[PDB]
């Protein structure tokens, strides 16, 4: 029930402890420790920026308009969510991460433009 | 198609590359470099805080309820968006920046109170 306690559980279970991990991301002799702290902050901010770009700011679970490609993974939902962990999944699709991120960004750019026209 | 590539293009074209620039804002000897990194972070956060105050959090394009005053600039939409670059535009209205920002803040504060009452 603590930090990473769900790491060995399946994805459908681990998805319920997202706030446990999110809150553990934040908190000459002594300089290298500042470098680590400054860097930890920059890392955090880059992930938040990325969620903002994709239109997922402020939430831990975000649905999008990008369809899933069977070429990335052809497993079905009852297999992925019930008989696999997040560590395993991360390895399975590690080669498509950049493709997926690119698609999410493009989707949001189109979504913002459409909303702007509707508000005219 | 890279960072600032659209700087010489017109405003109506440059506005389609907002994610390119947003992603380039984040990433005794060695101290002056930590100072630069910390300040880059504080600068970033102040702009994000300001978008938050105005009710534009999480988005690159945000509509507001503050009307445009003809006294700030009386150019029409073609003059501003079909030709004119963002560098030129910023110079043209730099003297009204604080006025506009103050109006945006006031508008959001009123919006929040109206929303709160409508939920009670």
């Amino acid at each position, epitope marked *: 029930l603590g930090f990473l306690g769900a790491a060995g559980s399946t994805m459908g279970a681990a998805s319920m402890t997202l706030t446990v991990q999110a809150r553990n991301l934040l908190s000459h002799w002594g300089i290298k420790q500042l470098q680590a702290r400054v860097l930890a902050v920059e890392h955090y901010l880059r992930d938040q920026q990325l969620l903002g770009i994709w239109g997922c700011s402020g939430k831990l679970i975000c649905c999008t308009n990008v369809p899933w490609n069977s070429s990335w993974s052809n497993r079905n939902l009852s297999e992925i969510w019930d008989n696999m962990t997040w560590l395993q999944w991360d390895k399975e699709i590690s080669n498509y991460t950049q493709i997926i991120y690119g698609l999410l960004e493009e989707s949001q750019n*189109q979504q913002e433009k459409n909303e*702007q026209d*509707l508000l*005219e | 198609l890279g960072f600032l590539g659209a700087a010489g293009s017109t405003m*109506g074209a440059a*506005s389609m590359t907002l994610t390119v620039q947003a992603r380039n804002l984040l990433s005794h000897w060695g101290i002056k470099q930590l100072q630069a990194r910390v300040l880059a972070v504080e600068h970033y956060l102040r702009d994000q805080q300001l978008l938050g105050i105005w009710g534009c959090s999480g988005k690159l394009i945000c509509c507001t309820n503050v009307p445009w005053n003809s006294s700030w600039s009386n150019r*029409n*939409l*073609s003059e501003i*968006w079909d030709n004119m670059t963002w560098l030129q535009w910023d110079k043209e209205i730099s003297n009204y920046t604080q006025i506009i920002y103050g109006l945006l803040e006031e508008s959001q504060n009123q919006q929040e109170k109206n929303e709160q009452d409508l939920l009670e």
Partner: antibody
Amino acid sequence: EVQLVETGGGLVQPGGSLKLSCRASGYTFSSFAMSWVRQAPGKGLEWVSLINDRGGLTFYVDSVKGRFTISRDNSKNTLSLQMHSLRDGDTAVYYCATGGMSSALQSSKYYFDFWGQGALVTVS
Amino acid sequence: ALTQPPSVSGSPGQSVTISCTGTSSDIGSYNYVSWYQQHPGKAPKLMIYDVTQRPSGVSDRFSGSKSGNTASLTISGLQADDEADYYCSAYAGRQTFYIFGGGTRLTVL
């Protein structure tokens, strides 16, 4: 000179389908929103559908909302309309027109600047 | 949807007015009124837009105006060549984007 040319269908039976298309020239196709306007042989004009210059947003008169699809191809300067279930009441001239909407950073429209000649669609 | 009269007429050189009456959440709310001229057998041509404006390409003999929920088209130096069905339309919001009246058969005497 701006031209809009319908190259649509003809006589079709009720309950079937018919596709219309319109070719454009003389202007940047991608700079304008477009629409279809219908005219029954004995009637006035009726707005039917509207599409955004980028093709992302479409609107329909409610009477065809579950039956018609409007689309766009900016590489081929082509506007199109796919009609299904073809009611006899849909017999009309279908005109290709430019206008009906603008795109936020542009001057407003809300009127139609150009018209084609009109395709005659007859449903038996 | 919009009401405009049939059979408006007059002799060359006489002015005529073709009215168009709508509703409050229509002509009464938006200044997006336009008029079209349709010669029988031909596609409509734009004559007036944004209530009072005319496109390049048409004469100044055509002028629009409005008050309340009523819009109208004024034709001044009426010509024989103005025989056509004149139509009014207006923007009426996002749920019902456009509405039109029937045509006015303008006859020149």
